[PDB]
């Protein structure tokens, strides 16, 4: 077949891990596949390069930042290349599908600078690759975090949107962007470990094409990395919402989730990384003084726990089971977010582990 | 970091809001058990934070609406009100990786400000920005997003 | 007023030092000069890259080594460019893949240009662009009259000729890479060895010692090498092609030949000695000892406790007394001269490595290089 | 980096044979030349056996006869004999960075044997390969090196 592979920085930490990876590359070639590899920079290099750039120049020009991160990845490209060559195979380094295809036809393993994930999925899209393998330190996408849920087990199959949903609400396994391209075209992914014979988790179906039976509850995700900010007493007028998020956008505050429901005024709650929280509060407190909102609140002990599954789309039961599960372990639902295929609640971080267990137990994940 | 692939509209749902649910373990459950046992398949669910009481709103097919009310009405004795809307409309911007590009969410809002359409409800994630508006504002709402984002 | 500046890895080992280099670059421009800059990789990055290469694929391809070491250099170039830009100057980066042409174009726009070895690239550029100086920055503020650890009252040289610098580098000094100084000599490109950690003007490597007037011609430095082994091949027949057998066989084994010496024939045979890195001494002896069989030579000696001490200076070219003083200095401390070799402006001698420090000390004071 | 090839027929060569390999002995030779104002250039001392060695040096041809007379008036010191050659030629390959490229030195010696010129003395370094031959053999030696190293430039010297 034709298989594209992405290796993250962990997998490429040291010469030793670089050989482990080169052994996998060549094994894949030797089984009779065309093989194209996308490499990240070596363990933490990229964000070491982001630190340095920022110390050298607080607002680094994107034109010099492209050189910095490209160069850090090039050392990963060469080192993997030299390693594959040490094991007998031939390598061709690239820093479009039409010229890769030639090298492919010559039988060389093509190594292309990365984001890496999007580079890989794109390349798999353009070449009509049979699969795109993502190699990190995780051997799959589990039904829950096993460090938290003893009965968490490895999925073997998962739809495109199911994964996106998990990727959106906890799972840091793939960059969402790369998965959207995955689904945009019909590019199967699979999550595998650099140090295992295990097939890993196939992310392959569009959930619409899923046979009902296989449309089940998929998994439970956890996120304790976010703060909740709440703005009170916002007049219910066009452009008032634009007032808050234009302010936050200007100060580069990452927004994950915003919720608004309904004195002729409403409230807007949103979620941001904890390190953004403080500057989010500093910004919004200013605007409060000027004839706008009545108060703005801060909370950095929030936790998000979610259930995602194509099976909840057409099944009247799941919300009430979600609810009943948290009730029976005495955790209080503070906020409720949803999509067609996911339920997400905000609670205290200290209740997150207990909640993940309860949902996971209630819905028969883990057999 | 991010990508924006399209916009969606929908005028097949109704909105029901249960006001004044006491913020306590198990109370959300009471509203959804009833509905679930009557086989009303629900979609959006929304609650903010708060008498120290709060409110939950959910959407369901309009075909099931009046009947969803009946089940909530005849079993209202622990909530103060339950409203029915049935003229609501949902517009979603679809994409992936929007958390690192907060400008997108700002622009979504500003796009509806400039066509003068009021946002009644909002629920977003890294992959989807959804708002409920008046069903009659849909075509404008949708149009405006296309111009903003292209 | 054009000035090429090469910054070593020590000059760019951290963000702080990079910013501090950008200011020096931007200050050099504000002083009315057009500036082109060449950067090594940060600190000990190249060595680290080389170690990682050698772990992954011994004898690795050159088109993967070129890609690996260019990337290390690219990190610095990007960071220095960002730094310069925070100081309000314009920078356009380059790869060799460019020329005088596209550089000189950017220079005329008043852009600081950051552009297959680093020392050689900098001197190459200065040459092509016809620069007034090529400055080599590092953590050493000049070239000295001797190794300061060994000779304690060794002084920084104000100025030095191309060949004097070339000659010192050939027998111990490791400040500039040799081929870059040779490039400077041929294209007549003045070099400045100076510190990026201070304001000291460093040392000028400028003229040809050909054009130093006999009266200004002086003694420049004392240099030391304790990294060589001495191999001697006895009973080589005095006939054409016999020398070739020795060196083809050493070259085919990639043995680095420094200094080779053969003195006049005096049986119908001569002898040949040569120094090599002590790492190579073992392979060199194996190759040579198994060709001793087959009659090519009567014996082959090995000695890895040999030190080399040299005196260089255009001064000795026209002046009869210097070899005499040199030999006399060593005799008066009690060191025996085992081997002697020369160039027009350099005396080199092999002695016991144990006698080496004291030999340099003796030479240094006898010629009052302090 | 190979810059050029230089020739020279301006020098005499003189050798002291059987100098005792003992501190001070080289000094005696060169002091005497220095005192007689003889400006030397090349100097070579390599092998010992007798435990004695030889020292050869070069100096301008006009000083050769004086140089050998000074040394002969100091023989038996220790020495077997002093030699004087007024027909020595010197060819040099000039360049840089030759240690890490031992091919160059090998190609130097191959060039001269393929032209059947015998190499009488050798003295090299990282930036120069020099031999002494019959001045007789200069043309052939030079030509041979120009062709071997793709140079044709004498600019080196
Ligand atoms: N179909 C599910 C909806 C779960 C909420 C997510 N849309 C139910 O009736 O409970
Ligand atoms: N001509 C000087 C230098 C010695 C030889 C070095 N090439 C002298 O007589 O001592
Ligand atoms: C969600 C709300 O109803 C309440 N906090 C509960 O847990 O049931
Ligand atoms: C955000 C919402 O409360 C407001 N009505 C708006 O449309 O901007
Ligand atoms: C001894 C060696 O130099 C010999 N004369 C040759 O030319 O090969
Ligand atoms: C020069 C050499 O022949 C002698 N051993 C000396 O040191 O004088």
PDB file of C-alpha atoms in Angstrom, chain C residues 19-162:
ATOM      1  CA  UNK C  19      20.723  40.455  21.124  1.00  0.00           C
ATOM      2  CA  UNK C  20      24.072  41.798  22.240  1.00  0.00           C
ATOM      3  CA  UNK C  21      25.551  40.796  18.868  1.00  0.00           C
ATOM      4  CA  UNK C  22      22.628  42.397  16.933  1.00  0.00           C
ATOM      5  CA  UNK C  23      23.384  45.753  18.639  1.00  0.00           C
ATOM      6  CA  UNK C  24      27.061  45.470  17.632  1.00  0.00           C
ATOM      7  CA  UNK C  25      25.966  44.713  14.054  1.00  0.00           C
ATOM      8  CA  UNK C  26      23.480  47.564  13.969  1.00  0.00           C
ATOM      9  CA  UNK C  27      26.075  49.880  15.615  1.00  0.00           C
ATOM     10  CA  UNK C  28      28.613  48.996  12.913  1.00  0.00           C
ATOM     11  CA  UNK C  29      26.077  50.090  10.283  1.00  0.00           C
ATOM     12  CA  UNK C  30      25.081  53.334  12.020  1.00  0.00           C
ATOM     13  CA  UNK C  31      28.811  54.172  11.903  1.00  0.00           C
ATOM     14  CA  UNK C  32      28.365  54.592   8.131  1.00  0.00           C
ATOM     15  CA  UNK C  33      29.208  51.057   6.972  1.00  0.00           C
ATOM     16  CA  UNK C  34      27.292  48.472   4.899  1.00  0.00           C
ATOM     17  CA  UNK C  35      27.430  45.200   6.845  1.00  0.00           C
ATOM     18  CA  UNK C  36      27.198  41.541   5.852  1.00  0.00           C
ATOM     19  CA  UNK C  37      27.090  38.967   8.650  1.00  0.00           C
ATOM     20  CA  UNK C  38      27.889  35.270   8.853  1.00  0.00           C
ATOM     21  CA  UNK C  39      26.776  33.126  11.793  1.00  0.00           C
ATOM     22  CA  UNK C  40      27.919  29.805  13.191  1.00  0.00           C
ATOM     23  CA  UNK C  41      25.394  27.644  15.032  1.00  0.00           C
ATOM     24  CA  UNK C  42      24.694  28.523  18.658  1.00  0.00           C
ATOM     25  CA  UNK C  43      27.333  27.531  21.185  1.00  0.00           C
ATOM     26  CA  UNK C  44      28.165  23.852  20.890  1.00  0.00           C
ATOM     27  CA  UNK C  45      25.245  23.055  18.530  1.00  0.00           C
ATOM     28  CA  UNK C  46      27.357  21.779  15.607  1.00  0.00           C
ATOM     29  CA  UNK C  47      29.288  19.322  17.811  1.00  0.00           C
ATOM     30  CA  UNK C  48      25.953  18.171  19.238  1.00  0.00           C
ATOM     31  CA  UNK C  49      24.612  17.752  15.673  1.00  0.00           C
ATOM     32  CA  UNK C  50      27.799  15.873  14.657  1.00  0.00           C
ATOM     33  CA  UNK C  51      27.541  13.559  17.689  1.00  0.00           C
ATOM     34  CA  UNK C  52      23.883  12.794  16.794  1.00  0.00           C
ATOM     35  CA  UNK C  53      24.850  12.111  13.156  1.00  0.00           C
ATOM     36  CA  UNK C  54      27.710   9.803  14.195  1.00  0.00           C
ATOM     37  CA  UNK C  55      25.323   7.912  16.506  1.00  0.00           C
ATOM     38  CA  UNK C  56      22.805   7.372  13.710  1.00  0.00           C
ATOM     39  CA  UNK C  57      24.963   6.526  10.685  1.00  0.00           C
ATOM     40  CA  UNK C  58      28.764   6.423  10.848  1.00  0.00           C
ATOM     41  CA  UNK C  59      30.273   7.730   7.596  1.00  0.00           C
ATOM     42  CA  UNK C  60      26.938   9.521   6.825  1.00  0.00           C
ATOM     43  CA  UNK C  61      26.177  11.053   3.408  1.00  0.00           C
ATOM     44  CA  UNK C  62      27.338  14.606   2.634  1.00  0.00           C
ATOM     45  CA  UNK C  63      23.889  15.681   1.349  1.00  0.00           C
ATOM     46  CA  UNK C  64      22.462  14.779   4.749  1.00  0.00           C
ATOM     47  CA  UNK C  65      25.421  16.381   6.586  1.00  0.00           C
ATOM     48  CA  UNK C  66      25.032  19.578   4.539  1.00  0.00           C
ATOM     49  CA  UNK C  67      21.327  19.598   5.481  1.00  0.00           C
ATOM     50  CA  UNK C  68      22.062  18.967   9.169  1.00  0.00           C
ATOM     51  CA  UNK C  69      24.733  21.673   9.678  1.00  0.00           C
ATOM     52  CA  UNK C  70      22.966  24.279   7.515  1.00  0.00           C
ATOM     53  CA  UNK C  71      19.914  23.888   9.809  1.00  0.00           C
ATOM     54  CA  UNK C  72      22.037  24.487  12.900  1.00  0.00           C
ATOM     55  CA  UNK C  73      23.380  27.635  11.232  1.00  0.00           C
ATOM     56  CA  UNK C  74      19.873  28.646  10.149  1.00  0.00           C
ATOM     57  CA  UNK C  75      18.698  28.818  13.774  1.00  0.00           C
ATOM     58  CA  UNK C  76      21.333  31.505  14.529  1.00  0.00           C
ATOM     59  CA  UNK C  77      20.657  33.450  11.289  1.00  0.00           C
ATOM     60  CA  UNK C  78      16.926  33.574  12.063  1.00  0.00           C
ATOM     61  CA  UNK C  79      17.483  34.651  15.680  1.00  0.00           C
ATOM     62  CA  UNK C  80      20.124  37.279  14.798  1.00  0.00           C
ATOM     63  CA  UNK C  81      17.732  38.625  12.086  1.00  0.00           C
ATOM     64  CA  UNK C  82      14.876  38.909  14.613  1.00  0.00           C
ATOM     65  CA  UNK C  83      17.302  40.614  16.999  1.00  0.00           C
ATOM     66  CA  UNK C  84      18.503  43.180  14.460  1.00  0.00           C
ATOM     67  CA  UNK C  85      14.887  43.938  13.564  1.00  0.00           C
ATOM     68  CA  UNK C  86      14.021  44.731  17.219  1.00  0.00           C
ATOM     69  CA  UNK C  87      16.814  47.324  16.988  1.00  0.00           C
ATOM     70  CA  UNK C  88      15.107  48.947  13.953  1.00  0.00           C
ATOM     71  CA  UNK C  89      17.304  47.783  11.060  1.00  0.00           C
ATOM     72  CA  UNK C  90      16.378  45.751   7.985  1.00  0.00           C
ATOM     73  CA  UNK C  91      17.779  42.286   7.386  1.00  0.00           C
ATOM     74  CA  UNK C  92      17.546  39.948   4.385  1.00  0.00           C
ATOM     75  CA  UNK C  93      18.789  36.422   4.937  1.00  0.00           C
ATOM     76  CA  UNK C  94      20.600  34.315   2.336  1.00  0.00           C
ATOM     77  CA  UNK C  95      21.768  30.826   1.547  1.00  0.00           C
ATOM     78  CA  UNK C  96      24.884  30.152  -0.555  1.00  0.00           C
ATOM     79  CA  UNK C  97      22.468  28.740  -3.158  1.00  0.00           C
ATOM     80  CA  UNK C  98      23.738  33.676  -2.978  1.00  0.00           C
ATOM     81  CA  UNK C  99      26.337  35.794  -4.844  1.00  0.00           C
ATOM     82  CA  UNK C 100      27.955  39.233  -4.819  1.00  0.00           C
ATOM     83  CA  UNK C 101      25.085  40.338  -7.087  1.00  0.00           C
ATOM     84  CA  UNK C 102      21.981  39.787  -4.935  1.00  0.00           C
ATOM     85  CA  UNK C 103      23.911  40.748  -1.756  1.00  0.00           C
ATOM     86  CA  UNK C 104      25.265  44.045  -3.176  1.00  0.00           C
ATOM     87  CA  UNK C 105      21.699  44.819  -4.272  1.00  0.00           C
ATOM     88  CA  UNK C 106      20.389  44.436  -0.713  1.00  0.00           C
ATOM     89  CA  UNK C 107      23.389  46.392   0.654  1.00  0.00           C
ATOM     90  CA  UNK C 108      22.578  49.373  -1.595  1.00  0.00           C
ATOM     91  CA  UNK C 109      19.055  49.400  -0.115  1.00  0.00           C
ATOM     92  CA  UNK C 110      20.771  49.655   3.286  1.00  0.00           C
ATOM     93  CA  UNK C 111      19.800  46.127   4.320  1.00  0.00           C
ATOM     94  CA  UNK C 112      22.060  44.214   6.708  1.00  0.00           C
ATOM     95  CA  UNK C 113      22.643  40.883   4.958  1.00  0.00           C
ATOM     96  CA  UNK C 114      22.923  37.605   6.925  1.00  0.00           C
ATOM     97  CA  UNK C 115      24.190  34.721   4.747  1.00  0.00           C
ATOM     98  CA  UNK C 116      30.760  25.497   2.810  1.00  0.00           C
ATOM     99  CA  UNK C 117      32.282  26.493   6.194  1.00  0.00           C
ATOM    100  CA  UNK C 118      31.425  29.643   8.143  1.00  0.00           C
ATOM    101  CA  UNK C 119      34.930  31.143   8.417  1.00  0.00           C
ATOM    102  CA  UNK C 120      35.504  30.435   4.718  1.00  0.00           C
ATOM    103  CA  UNK C 121      32.130  31.825   3.661  1.00  0.00           C
ATOM    104  CA  UNK C 122      32.776  35.095   5.499  1.00  0.00           C
ATOM    105  CA  UNK C 123      36.204  35.539   3.915  1.00  0.00           C
ATOM    106  CA  UNK C 124      34.884  34.411   0.517  1.00  0.00           C
ATOM    107  CA  UNK C 125      32.180  37.083   0.734  1.00  0.00           C
ATOM    108  CA  UNK C 126      34.465  39.902   1.832  1.00  0.00           C
ATOM    109  CA  UNK C 127      36.617  38.925  -1.155  1.00  0.00           C
ATOM    110  CA  UNK C 128      33.751  38.891  -3.678  1.00  0.00           C
ATOM    111  CA  UNK C 129      32.118  42.059  -2.322  1.00  0.00           C
ATOM    112  CA  UNK C 130      35.571  43.733  -2.056  1.00  0.00           C
ATOM    113  CA  UNK C 131      35.280  44.491   1.696  1.00  0.00           C
ATOM    114  CA  UNK C 132      37.578  46.681   3.810  1.00  0.00           C
ATOM    115  CA  UNK C 133      37.618  44.057   6.579  1.00  0.00           C
ATOM    116  CA  UNK C 134      36.269  40.682   7.495  1.00  0.00           C
ATOM    117  CA  UNK C 135      35.983  40.592  11.299  1.00  0.00           C
ATOM    118  CA  UNK C 136      36.001  37.236  13.082  1.00  0.00           C
ATOM    119  CA  UNK C 137      34.218  37.417  16.448  1.00  0.00           C
ATOM    120  CA  UNK C 138      34.491  34.877  19.232  1.00  0.00           C
ATOM    121  CA  UNK C 139      35.379  34.759  22.957  1.00  0.00           C
ATOM    122  CA  UNK C 140      39.126  35.316  22.336  1.00  0.00           C
ATOM    123  CA  UNK C 141      39.999  38.986  21.914  1.00  0.00           C
ATOM    124  CA  UNK C 142      43.016  38.468  19.634  1.00  0.00           C
ATOM    125  CA  UNK C 143      45.935  36.322  18.592  1.00  0.00           C
ATOM    126  CA  UNK C 144      48.682  36.133  21.172  1.00  0.00           C
ATOM    127  CA  UNK C 145      52.464  35.759  21.209  1.00  0.00           C
ATOM    128  CA  UNK C 146      51.975  32.283  22.755  1.00  0.00           C
ATOM    129  CA  UNK C 147      49.400  30.079  24.563  1.00  0.00           C
ATOM    130  CA  UNK C 148      48.657  32.124  27.766  1.00  0.00           C
ATOM    131  CA  UNK C 149      48.101  29.020  29.928  1.00  0.00           C
ATOM    132  CA  UNK C 150      51.634  27.825  29.109  1.00  0.00           C
ATOM    133  CA  UNK C 151      53.475  31.117  28.709  1.00  0.00           C
ATOM    134  CA  UNK C 152      51.952  33.461  31.310  1.00  0.00           C
ATOM    135  CA  UNK C 153      53.277  36.857  30.073  1.00  0.00           C
ATOM    136  CA  UNK C 154      52.088  36.297  26.487  1.00  0.00           C
ATOM    137  CA  UNK C 155      50.794  39.496  24.827  1.00  0.00           C
ATOM    138  CA  UNK C 156      47.986  40.183  22.344  1.00  0.00           C
ATOM    139  CA  UNK C 157      49.395  40.998  18.901  1.00  0.00           C
ATOM    140  CA  UNK C 158      48.370  44.353  17.453  1.00  0.00           C
ATOM    141  CA  UNK C 159      48.856  43.189  13.863  1.00  0.00           C
ATOM    142  CA  UNK C 160      50.132  40.267  11.846  1.00  0.00           C
ATOM    143  CA  UNK C 161      50.749  39.393   8.176  1.00  0.00           C
ATOM    144  CA  UNK C 162      48.702  36.793   6.281  1.00  0.00           C
TER     145      UNK C 162
END
